[PDB]
Amino acid sequence: GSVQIVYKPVDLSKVTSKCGSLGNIHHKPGGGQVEVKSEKLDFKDRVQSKIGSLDNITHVPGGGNKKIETHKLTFRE
Amino acid sequence: GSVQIVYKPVDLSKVTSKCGSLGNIHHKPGGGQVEVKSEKLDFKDRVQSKIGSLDNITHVPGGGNKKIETHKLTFRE
Amino acid sequence: GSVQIVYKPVDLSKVTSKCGSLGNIHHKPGGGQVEVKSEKLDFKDRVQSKIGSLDNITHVPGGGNKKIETHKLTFRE
Amino acid sequence: GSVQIVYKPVDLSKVTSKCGSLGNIHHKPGGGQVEVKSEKLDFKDRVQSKIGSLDNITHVPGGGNKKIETHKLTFRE
Amino acid sequence: GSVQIVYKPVDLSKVTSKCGSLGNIHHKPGGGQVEVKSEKLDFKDRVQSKIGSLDNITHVPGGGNKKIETHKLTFRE
Amino acid sequence: GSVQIVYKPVDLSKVTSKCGSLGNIHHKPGGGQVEVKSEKLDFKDRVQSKIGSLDNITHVPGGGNKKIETHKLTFRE
């Protein structure tokens, strides 16, 4: 017995943007209050966390485009 | 017995945008209050979490386009 | 018995951006208050964490494009 | 003709307070936003004013008692 | 003609306070935003004013008592 | 014609306070933002003013008592 696998996916996909001007962007928050109370924390594998935060983000990319692609080929005998 | 698999998907897909101007964008929050109370936290594999947050985000990408694609080819014997 | 695997995915994908001007971007927060109270913290493998934060980010990339791609080929006998 | 005025008001009035303890007082505001827009202001005699304010006051007097008294005696001929 | 005025008001008034303890007083504001816009200001006699303010006051007097009194005696001929 | 004025007001008024302890007083503001914009200012006699301020005051007098008194005696012929 013989097994042949040919894995040849072809990609020609374009993700693109055009813009004239980014322009006036104003981000003026007036800060509040946050309180968190806890006794014990206990984190193990691959935990990702935020506790007690007051964060402001202004994010103005000129493009900001994304292309996420994953190829997988498991085999067994 | 022989098994032949040919995996040749072809992609020519375009994700694209055009814009004249981004223009006036104003983001002016007036901050509130947050309180969280807890005794014990216990997180294990692949937990993702936020507790007690007061966050503001302004996100103005000029394109902001996404293309997410996944290929998978499991095999067994 | 013989097993042949050919893994030849072809990529010609472009992620691109064009912009005229980035322009006026103003980020003027008015800082608040944060309090966090805890007795014990206990973190193990691959934990990623923030506690008690008041952070401001202005991020204005001229492109800001991303292309994330992963190839995997497990085999067994 | 003769005019006699005797002005002899007698005051023995007490304004008083007693207290055991002032105790726990917490004042935790989360700041908002204020905007005021105007072209021209024009103020004359005895004007008292506030424009565009975000103020917090905690006032805990141990007594805090007031006694306001006014005596007046106009005369004409 | 003769005019006699006797102005002899008697004051024995006490304004007083007693307190055991002032105690825990917490004043924790989270600062906001204020904007004021104007072209022309024009103030004359006895004007008192505030424009564009973000003020916090904690005032804990041990007594804090007030006694305001005014005597007036106008005469004409 | 004769005019007699006797102005003999008697004051025995006490303004007083007693306190055991002043105690824990905490004043922890989180500073905000203030902007003021103006073209012309024009102030004349007895003007008192604040523009564009971010002020914090903690005032803990052990007594803090006030006694304001004014005597006036105008005369005309």
**Which residues in chain E touch residue B30, judged by CB atoms under 8 angstroms apart?**
32-33
Please tell me the distance in Å from E49's CA to the nearest CA on chain D: 5
Which residue type is seen at A17?
Answer: S
* Bridge partner residues of E10 (DSSP): D10, F10
Phi and psi at residue D53, to the nearest 5°: -125, 145
Is E62 buried (19+), middle (13-18) or exposed (0-12) by CB count in 10 A? Answer: buried
Which residue type is seen at F74?
Answer: T
Q: Which of F27, B33, A67 is nearest to D26 (CA)?
A: F27
Cα distance between residue D25 and residue A64, in whole Å = 49
Judge whether E32 is closer than 8 Å to chain B, CB to CB. yes
Cα distance between residue D2 and residue B25, in whole Å = 82
B65 three-state secondary structure: coil
Please tell me the distance in Å from F56's CA to the nearest CA on chain A: 17
**Which residues in chain F touch residue D52, judged by CB atoms under 8 angstroms apart?**
36
Contact by Cβ (8 Å): E11, D12: no
Judge whether F30 is closer than 8 Å to chain A, CB to CB. yes
The DSSP 8-state label assigned to residue E45 in this structure reads T
Look-up of token digits 């003013």 = F49
Judge whether B29 is closer than 8 Å to chain D, CB to CB. yes
The DSSP 8-state label assigned to residue C20 in this structure reads S
Side by side, which strands form the sheet with F66-72? Answer: D66-72, E66-72, F66-72
Is C72 buried (19+), middle (13-18) or exposed (0-12) by CB count in 10 A? Answer: exposed
Side by side, which strands form the sheet with D40-43? Answer: D40-43, E40-43, F40-43
Resolution (A): 2.7
Please tell me the distance in Å from A19's CA to the nearest CA on chain E: 32
Method: cryo-EM
Cα distance between residue D73 and residue F7, in whole Å = 11
Q: Is the dihedral of CA D27, D28, D32, D36 positive or negative?
A: positive
Contact D30 A28 (CB under 8 A): no
**Which residues in chain C touch residue B54, judged by CB atoms under 8 angstroms apart?**
32
Contact by Cβ (8 Å): A60, B63: no
Decide the pairing of beta strands E56-59 and D40-43: unpaired
Contact by Cβ (8 Å): A69, C40: no
* Bridge partner residues of B67 (DSSP): A67
Contact by Cβ (8 Å): C6, A7: yes
What's the length of chain B? 77
Query: By CA distance, what is A30's nearest residue in D?
Result: D32
Cα distance between residue D69 and residue F10, in whole Å = 14
What's the length of chain F? 77
